[PDB]
Amino acid sequence: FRCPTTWSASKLYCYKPFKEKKTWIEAERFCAKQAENGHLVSIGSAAEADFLDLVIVVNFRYRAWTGLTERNLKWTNGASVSYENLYEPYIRKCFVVQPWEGKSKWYKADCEEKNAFLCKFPKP
Amino acid sequence: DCPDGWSSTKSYCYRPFKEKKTWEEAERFCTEQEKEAHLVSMENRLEAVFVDMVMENNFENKIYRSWIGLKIENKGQRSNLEWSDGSSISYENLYEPYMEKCFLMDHQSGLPKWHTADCEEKNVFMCKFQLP
């Protein structure tokens, strides 16, 4: 099981950063075109975070979309929040990774901001 | 029919409670009603107005601050966070601190807006459930 050229392989996944700047949704859609089950990167452990940091350093100050976003509000009874009388608007953000003291940290960003982005897909 | 002590509309039953609780205690209390209930939700303006009128009818037309059935937090698998590939939130490395915000309606004058608050505040609340 060989990751395509330019992608970096962990045991189970192929990863690749792309420099071309895109909104969160068009980055996600770009990742999904790359492969079966392709998405913006998810980070499931410290070891994956460290591996992803290496992927970034091999390829590249960076600011890149991850697959992490905020959910819609949902009432405790399970209903969607359609109507609201919120004092301040709830606006779902998405998360970029940026360098912070030699590792990286995840920061909220406007989903319509154009950024570099990171794709992941499962081998097989 | 709605049980005794509950206000009814066509399909829903509502009940204000004066005993102040944290947001989690309040929601838990609602879920433990003989008919499982939840903290009040409002799906349109008229329902919000109704809920406010029931509260006012129960609190002597005074100012109040009542929990409602919304909470957001950024830690663990019940967060308001999700991965586009559907994997669980099993690891986080947020710049922002871990936090939780619980929503309430604060009646000052007129229909209350819904504000965020410390989940450990002790507030009055309302339960709601749907008739069969």
Curated annotation (Swiss-Prot), chain A:
It holds the Pfam family Lectin_C. Disulfide bonds join C3-C14, C31-C119, C94-C111. Residues 2-121 form the C-type lectin domain. GO terms for molecular function: toxin activity. The keyword Ligase does not apply. Keywords: Disulfide bond, Hemostasis impairing toxin, Platelet aggregation inhibiting toxin, Secreted, Toxin. It comes from the Eukaryota. Belongs to the snaclec family. This is Snaclec rhodocetin subunit beta. It comes from Calloselasma rhodostoma (Malayan pit viper).
Swiss-Prot record, chain B:
SUPFAM superfamilies: C-type lectin-like (SSF56436). It is found in: Secreted. Signal peptide: none annotated. InterPro entries: C-type_lectin-like, C-type_lectin-like/link_sf, C-type_lectin/snaclec_domain, CTDL_fold. Expressed by the venom gland. PROSITE patterns: C_TYPE_LECTIN_2. Residues 1-129 form the C-type lectin domain. Disulfide bonds join C2-C13, C30-C127, C102-C119. Keywords: Disulfide bond, Hemostasis impairing toxin, Platelet aggregation inhibiting toxin, Secreted, Toxin. GO terms for cellular component: extracellular region. It comes from the Eukaryota. One of its GO terms (molecular function) is toxin activity. Heterotetramer of subunit alpha, beta, gamma and delta; only the gamma and the delta subunits are disulfide-linked. Alpha-beta heterodimer and gamma-delta heterodimer associate orthogonally, giving a cruciform conformation. This heterotetramer may covalently dimerizes thanks to the gamma subunit. Potent inhibitor of collagen-induced platelet aggregation. It acts by binding to the integrin alpha2A domain and blocks collagen binding to integrin alpha-2/beta-1 (ITGA2/ITGB1). The gamma/delta subunits mainly contribute to this activity. Belongs to the snaclec family. This is Snaclec rhodocetin subunit alpha. It comes from Calloselasma rhodostoma. The lineage of its organism: Eukaryota, Metazoa, Chordata, Craniata, Vertebrata.
